[model samples]
Target: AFCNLRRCELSCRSLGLLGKCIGEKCECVPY
Candidate 1:
């Protein structure tokens, strides 16, 4: 799992709920 970060469009893996990389945005919401 991964999420977008402030440095790039891919980071913060702790926010991925779908068990994959959410390279959509930098904001990682629990909902």
Candidate 2:
């Protein structure tokens, strides 16, 4: 089966999670 690797709400959604892009936000931080 094929997986949905892309986020469906990425376009119409915000760019942050919990305040940003949720789980799709690629933050450039050291964590």
Candidate 3:
């Protein structure tokens, strides 16, 4: 939620990707 790291991590985990919070933005990529 709120485009934060926690939110991205949770979401990305489901897709088997790494979650990152860069400059207040959520990003997902392969680990």
For candidate 2, the per-residue lDDT at 2 reads: 33
> All candidates' lDDT scores?
0.41, 0.33, 0.80
**Colliding pairs, model 3:** none
TM-scores of the candidates are 0.18, 0.16, 0.54
Error (Å) of candidate 2 at residue 26 is 22
Model 1, poorest ten-residue lDDT window? 12-21
Model 1 C-alpha lDDT per residue in residues 1-31, reported as the tens digit of each score:
4543543423434445323334654543455
Q: Between candidates 2 and 3, name the one with more favorable TM-score.
A: 3
The clash numbers for all candidates, in the given order, read 0, 6, 0
Q: Which candidate is the best by lDDT?
A: 3
Residue runs of model 2 more than 4 Å from their true location after superposition: 1-6, 14-31
Name the candidate that leads on TM-score. Answer: 3
Could you tell me the C-alpha RMSD of candidate 1 in Å?
7.9
**lDDT tens digits, residue span 1-31, model 3:** 3557877899889988879887768789874
